[PDB]
Design a protein around this ligand. Structure first.
Ligand SMILES: COc1c(N2C[C@@H]3CCCN[C@@H]3C2)c(F)cc2c(=O)c(C(=O)O)cn(C3CC3)c12
Ligand SMILES: COc1c(N2C[C@@H]3CCCN[C@@H]3C2)c(F)cc2c(=O)c(C(=O)O)cn(C3CC3)c12
Ligand SMILES: [Mg+2]
Ligand SMILES: [Mg+2]
Lengths: 482, 198, 485, 194
DNA sequence: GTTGTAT
DNA sequence: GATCATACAAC
DNA sequence: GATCATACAACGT
DNA sequence: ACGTTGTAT
């Protein structure tokens, strides 16, 4: 029996609890941000790896270290989830452009899982550094962590369009998302094209961005679905395997598949094909031996009586999949089914904000340093009088005040003058300070000019994007057909 | 007063830290998210009148499940076994083991999810229990908590705050469960798009 | 097939691999080093926590972070093993003096496991700080970690006799150690005793170290086993549950178990008893309630009328773990080898290790003080001849020639001259000189003291005694385990 | 080669039906299993995981030996049969390679596996079918493993040869035997600590 | 059944 | 360590 | 997240 | 032959 009891309507608590869980799953778990293309766990892993000092230059750190730090500081969930995410960010068949570089067993294409965290080490990929470019230059807003004793980025600078490039997935509450991966160079071309001519259409965009570029490669049948997709945010495209029918030394046929579709297991396909083989559906096949090495990829042999028919069957039975575009992403807090143009515009604007913020940071730093340097230059110009003032002083306070009164200095300048090492009172030191000061002046001029002109910012974005394209982009893996 | 005498066979679930009483008008049953909170509850609960049943993971949404899947699932089976009420065509409310069933889910959003699922289960297959007013919900100020904290804050009747779950109209209720939990996705998405303040 | 095929004899590879695994388990997993009474995993959890900065003062940190760091930097094994070890050294009924403070579900005496690492956080206990005290004064050797990119302490300072006080266990290969926990104050009294009178007999030691003091308490039968154990390292003693007989409000007898023996599960005893009762292997039992509340242990076995509670009690002592045995096999690693030690040998090892620690610390402090004093002399000369100094500096292009000319002129070292060149301008005030003077004088006093301490062993011994006395003053317990004949 | 289509849970089999070239690699855990299987040449090399420390048969009852699932998996894979069925002319692999981890626990598992093989697969070891891989193990890429320890034209292997069977039986009865004292003496004698 | 973040 | 159920949405 | 089998010594039942 | 204890696979 209770002393203090209250009544609770069923529908009320149901509604409140459900809205809570749903909203929290949508805007903080299952869906990515339109700007950096990341969902909370991934962003927290990248930032966690950043602070951990596992940049591509530095050596790897064990997975348990990273998982531990990430959970303890940012991601208030289980080990298995974080580690699973990290593993997925280090597999060539999962991420078109991998964000994690790992050593040891990280699973195979054939469904095999990664090794334990106590056996695998990992660091950031070279391209993930672009996701983290100038994060330390106030390019991104921060927030207190769950424990409210650390801070984490709300978003990442993301100097390459990670959303379209790496795709997204998937299931949430009341909604789900599905975006395919794209070739880096083409996505960059699309961004630059949107920046150049704002009056562009979908077809024009498709000229430089033909369609999806899957990490597994393979083929895509049709283009109408792709157009409907990029235009409306939702669509449907068919995917097929890349194959070839060779000739044996016995003088027969040999249907060999070299590229399986996206998110497709060769082993599972093998099992299902055998299951369908012992059911009199697919006749003619003599033996189905998976002959994939660590150098590449699955041989299916047939008998006299018909290879084309048998392969057509093997495609019409399972080898052939349906990609359903449902490009849904979080934008300004609320989730939305976005077109290609909307994603592109969002990423562009985000890039403008990042570049501008960075330029402002650099500006402020440069100006402060210049101020202090003016102070120091004055000090070296009046060294004897300065040291006279300092010696005459009893406490550093009256020294500071006296310097500020005599040489017309600020608190910062006088502080810097007081915190001067004796070894910088030499002859050649003054000139070096002068040079640094002049260079600083030029720099500040340039940055102010950048902040006064949007066109320059846009150009900076285009240039740096082009440099990413040059440094990282791959040749197209997926061949499009009709 | 009548109390248990140990020795009994009982055949109650392998979990379930049952109480030392036999009075289904003074005893309580706390449904708990995982053994992480299970340990905290079990060791600091006044084991005379308070029992603890750990439900592991996200319980099955009965609205989106076959009855063949419901009667197969062992978590719901364990709950019903703990209640000793019976299933559907055997549900005797006047033969329960606890007249105070406290839902003590975790204080995160997934806890709210589990609470939701449990409420669906209770409204759809233990309806007399909610009708009789046996279903209560704990209102904390759980694995990340000590014994003393758990007790003194949430389990001690002298200083705890609990909520009695009482239905208004069965129509609006059934509709709500059919929307939030039913296989119908679109109306749920409409609900989340029309009744959520981001 | 292959090409380069060597040949291995079965017995050879067997003996080799087995010697490998055996030695690895013996010297670096199962048995603790006698000096600090720690196994590699516990030592790595403590040191890892120290480097993490989760000291008593600083707040807790998530367990997964601590275990992640311990694993990544020091302990190359399962996350589970580390977390389990930590959780264990956080439990009062497992560790006589807990080395870890925890928050959240850390397990129960009933055998319930701790919560997942994503719920529990932890830190050092106030007493573990003594296990780590003066770690940063070269009181302890270091080695490379397994990855050879970090460094770890071989042994800890251990400013309280942790081996005897907390006990040790157990299972190795070809060997197995078993040491019971002891009372802090008593073990310290024994240590000081051996320090003063070195011709002390085992009986004299037992006059202050009566015997084991288990975290749960209970009773001990047979002190002969205690003496034999303290004199040989091997011995057997009896442990009985602290119990009492009550009377119900209905008039019949009631057995009340209030303290169970070391490493004995209450729930397991309940189950065993029930299974013994519903089998008629024990008769006269009316009820078996577990009335233990979060403030005390109360295990009730209610007896029917016309039945003796004494017969039932003794039958429980005979058939259940309400009464068990303890087998002293005091085995620990000393000088890199496993040894079965007497009490006196363990105490001696601890005192020696302690002397090493204290002497090392004093040497460290002396070196540091003298260095700082040297630099201070340099700064004094500079701050006296400031004009000349500043002149020499200004008339110098390179810093190398400035340093060289400062050294040449004021007859100084390279370190002193570098310190002068590194002087902030604010250190040229009128009130700065006197401060430096005072600090210098204090440094002279300190150096004199430390030099005296290093010159006299008696002062080292005395320091050890006093600091032990302070540890005991700050952390000691009242005895829990009653020793009876 | 085989033909598939035919009817253990683990065990990634090979492809060639030839017990003269084919090789079975006993690897510990699915962590090593992943890499080993990922780079293995799926024609004459199959992998078998050994989850956990295998049972010491020199100290276990027959009732518990026959009960153990791992031993049953090794005997199922080898296709030899057990006890009064040990048909060595029905073995499925020409090379049973012990590929344990490169730590001390791996050496322990090597000892255990060698006791299992010597005691209950004696004809196999008596006919030069048992090998020991020589790594320089989940902390390794598939290409790394393939290039280092799994490639025939490279790699170093130890052929387990038995000399005096009396000495073998003696050593097995001493190290892995029921008696503890001789093990303690052996440890005290054949070990250099400091 | 499966996809991926979660309990 | 491996192996187990399941929410959630969409083929 | 909860459980599951095993080495290893020493004692117990 | 089993269980039970604590660091390990
Ligand atoms: C598969 O091995 C384990 C078992 N089993 C052994 C048996 C045979 C195979 C399948 N059935 C059981 C499960 C187990 F019960 C517990 C643990 C375990 O706790 C643990 C750890 O790191 O904490 C690690 N391992 C693996 C690293 C050895 C465990
Ligand atoms: C007991 O819940 C889990 C199950 N089960 C649910 C079933 C229902 C009752 C009987 N036990 C089974 C096993 C499971 F199969 C997997 C996971 C799991 O993978 C996981 C994780 O963090 O990766 C976390 N949990 C946490 C929720 C505890 C899991
Ligand atoms: Mg899971
Ligand atoms: Mg374990």
């Amino acid at each position: 029996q209770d002393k203090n009891l209250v009544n609770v309507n069923l529908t009320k608590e149901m509604k409140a609890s459900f809205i809570d869980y749903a909203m929290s799953v949508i805007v903080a778990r299952a869906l990515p941000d339109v700007r950096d293309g990341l969902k909370p766990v991934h962003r927290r892993i990248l930032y966690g790896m950043n602070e951990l000092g596992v940049t591509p230059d530095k050596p790897h750190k064990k997975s348990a270290r990273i998982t531990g730090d990430v959970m303890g500081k940012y991601h208030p969930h289980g080990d298995s989830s974080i580690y699973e995410a990290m593993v997925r960010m280090a597999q060539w068949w999962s991420y078109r452009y991998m964000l994690v570089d790992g050593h040891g067993n990280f699973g195979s294409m054939d469904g095999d899982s990664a090794a334990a965290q106590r056996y695998t080490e990992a660091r950031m990929s070279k391209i993930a550094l672009e996701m983290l470019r100038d994060i330390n230059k106030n390019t991104v807003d921060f927030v207190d962590n769950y424990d409210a004793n650390e801070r984490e980025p709300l978003v990442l600078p993301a100097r390459f369009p990670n959303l379209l490039v790496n795709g997204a997935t998937g299931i949430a509450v009341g909604m789900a998302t599905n975006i395919p991966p794209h070739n880096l160079g083409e996505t960059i071309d699309a961004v630059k094209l949107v920046m150049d001519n704002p009056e562009v259409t979908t077809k024009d965009l498709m000229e430089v961005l033909p369609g999806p570029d899957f990490p597994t490669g393979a083929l895509v049948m049709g283009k109408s679905g792709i157009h409907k997709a990029y235009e409306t945010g939702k669509g449907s495209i068919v995917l097929r395997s890349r194959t070839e029918i060779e000739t044996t030394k016995t003088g027969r046929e040999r249907i060999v598949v070299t590229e399986f579709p996206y998110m497709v297991n060769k082993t599972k396909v093998h099992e299902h094909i055998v299951r369908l083989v012992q059911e009199k559906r697919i006749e003619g096949i003599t033996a189905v031996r998976d002959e994939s090495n660590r150098e590449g990829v699955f041989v299916i042999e047939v008998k006299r009586d018909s290879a084309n028919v048998i392969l057509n069957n093997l495609f019409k039975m399972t080898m052939q999949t349906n990609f359903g575009f449902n490009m849904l992403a979080i934008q300004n807090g609320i989730p939305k089914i976005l077109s290609l143009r909307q994603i592109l515009d969002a990423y562009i604007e985000h890039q403008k904000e990042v570049v501008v913020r960075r330029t402002r940071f650099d500006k402020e730093k440069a100006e402060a340093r210049a101020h202090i340097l003016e102070g120091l230059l004055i000090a070296l110009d009046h060294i004897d009088e300065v040291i006279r003032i300092i010696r005459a002083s009893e406490t550093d306070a009256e020294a500071q005040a006296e310097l500020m009164s005599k040489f017309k200095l600020s608190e910062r300048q006088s502080q810097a003058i007081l915190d001067m090492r004796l070894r910088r009172l030499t002859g050649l030191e003054r000139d070096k300070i002068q040079s640094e000061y002049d260079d600083l002046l030029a720099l500040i001029a340039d940055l102010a000019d950048i902040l006064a002109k949007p066109e320059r910012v846009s150009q900076i974005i285009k240039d740096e994007l082009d440099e990413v394209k040059r440094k990282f982009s791959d040749k197209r893996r997926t061949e499009l057909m009709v | 007063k009548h109390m248990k005498s140990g020795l009994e066979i009982s055949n109650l679930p392998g979990k379930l830290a049952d109480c030392s009483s036999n009075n289904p008008a003074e005893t309580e049953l706390f449904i708990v998210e995982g053994d992480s909170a299970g340990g905290s509850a079990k060791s600091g609960r006044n084991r005379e009148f308070q029992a603890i049943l750990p439900i592991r993971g996200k319980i099955l949404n009965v609205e989106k499940a076959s009855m063949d899947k419901i009667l197969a699932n062992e978590e719901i089976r364990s709950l019903f076994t703990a209640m000793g009420t019976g299933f559907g065509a055997e549900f005797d409310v006047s033969k329960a083991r606890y007249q105070k069933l406290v839902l003590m889910t975790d204080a995160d959003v997934d806890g709210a999810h589990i609470r939701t699922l449990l409420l669906t289960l209770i409204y759809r297959y233990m309806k007399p229990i909610l009708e009789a007013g046996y279903v209560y919900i704990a209102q904390p100020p759980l694995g990340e908590m000590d014994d003393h904290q758990l007790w003194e804050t949430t389990m001690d009747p002298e200083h705890r705050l609990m909520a009695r779950v009482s239905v208004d109209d069965a129509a609006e209720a059934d509709k709500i469960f059919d929307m939030l939990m039913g296989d119908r996705v679109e109306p749920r998405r409409e609900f989340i798009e029309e009744n959520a303040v981001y």
